[PDB]
């Protein structure tokens, strides 16, 4: 999920303010990526032994 686009629809007026909350935008991607990365590790170890 792209925080920048989700929160602020395609508009810099909102995009500027989002910069003030810092990593809240990014670290979510890190969280979600953290999920989606291992989601294939699940299927990895279950099915391919």
């Amino acid at each position: 999920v792209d925080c920048t686009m989700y929160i602020c629809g395609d508009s810099t007026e909102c995009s500027n303010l989002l910069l003030q909350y810092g990593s809240f935008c990014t670290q979510l991607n890190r969280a979600l990526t953290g999920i989606a990365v291992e989601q294939d590790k699940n299927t990895q170890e279950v099915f391919a032994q």
Partner: protein
């Protein structure tokens, strides 16, 4: 597009793998204003 990922890892060493660089968007060519196909009687007032 390669240089923008190294700014995501903050490292000059980039480990073998796939990394997600900033998203891209398609941008709009033009604006389309559409209003259905009265008129004010300025030909009936002014003439």
């Amino acid at each position: 597009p390669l240089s923008e990922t190294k700014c995501t890892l903050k490292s000059f060493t980039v480990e073998k793998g796939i990394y997600q660089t900033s998203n891209f968007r398609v941008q709009p060519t033009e604006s389309i204003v559409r209003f259905p196909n009265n008129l004010c009687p300025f030909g009936e007032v002014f003439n």
